[PDB]
């Protein structure tokens, strides 16, 4: 579908096309994402060196994305140190929390502008 996003760009919300995938199985989403982002590397490197580049806001939402990335990075680092120390509940809550990390991040992923 079409979703124009005005606090991404400084002037023109491009009418950027959004692609969703929704499923029971988180593995099928990981696979279809893998295939599609391969396909979006293809199209973007085919168009780059020919097409022009949109300007950014530089401010507000890149920093929203920075803070929400930094909190998750600390969380994964503390999780890796606990997995190294091997205390108790070997890796079940760790597994089910790292998939929550994944889900969090995937929903908006690489607004390519």
């Amino acid at each position: 579908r079409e979703v124009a996003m005005t606090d991404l760009c400084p002037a023109g919300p491009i009418q950027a096309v959004e692609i969703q995938v929704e499923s029971s199985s988180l593995a099928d989403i990981c696979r279809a994402h893998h295939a599609v982002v391969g396909r979006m590397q293809t199209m973007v490197t085919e168009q780059a060196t020919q097409g022009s580049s949109a300007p950014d806001l530089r401010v507000q939402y890149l920093r929203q994305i920075h803070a929400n990335h930094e909190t998750l990075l600390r969380e994964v680092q503390t999780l890796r140190d606990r997995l190294c120390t091997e205390d108790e509940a070997s890796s079940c809550a760790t597994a089910q929390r790292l998939l929550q990390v994944y889900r969090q991040l995937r929903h908006p992923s690489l607004i390519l502008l």
Partner: protein, 220 residues
Amino acid sequence: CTVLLQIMERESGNCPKDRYVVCGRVFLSLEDLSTGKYLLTFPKKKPIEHMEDLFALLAAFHKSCFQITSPGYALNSMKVWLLEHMKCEIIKEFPEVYFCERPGSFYGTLFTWKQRTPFEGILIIYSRNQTVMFQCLHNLIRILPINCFLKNLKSGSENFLIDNMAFTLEKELVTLSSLSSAIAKHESNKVSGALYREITLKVAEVQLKSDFAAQKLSNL
């Protein structure tokens, strides 16, 4: 037969290394075998001292790989089950390999056992068809603890897949925080869309790795 070993690199998405090697030939015929010479036909080939023999089995053999955790209890009934119930010979050369010498319907079935953190071992079953791999677990489930939790593993162990997933995401989050930091210095010098696109390629290259580790852990 001619014997041809092909080699692709993964790292590079250009397919830039298609190195091929022709690593010899194998003549075979009816008469070489009419005199044995190469064949593995059993119980005589017990005292295992041409390691090419061992490998030829690890290959032709149906493979089954299992996680074992006895959570509130250390686990060494394995070392009794292996050497006594099933009557294993350890191969000296590779002392983590067990060849079964129980003399009916388990003979020439190979195990291996890594006991890291004496709760959590990992067992790999080489069998001469699947009926044999069933008859082993059945015979082991009788001999295990009550809480000892079996589980089927297609593609690597749970510990290593969580480590792999964790690293492909920790690098990804760093590369996206690097995106924002590369923009946040551009503020001190509005952003180059060219720079944004440049960094989304590098982040896409790492996202593809986290996706793969996630289908691996979201099978498991």
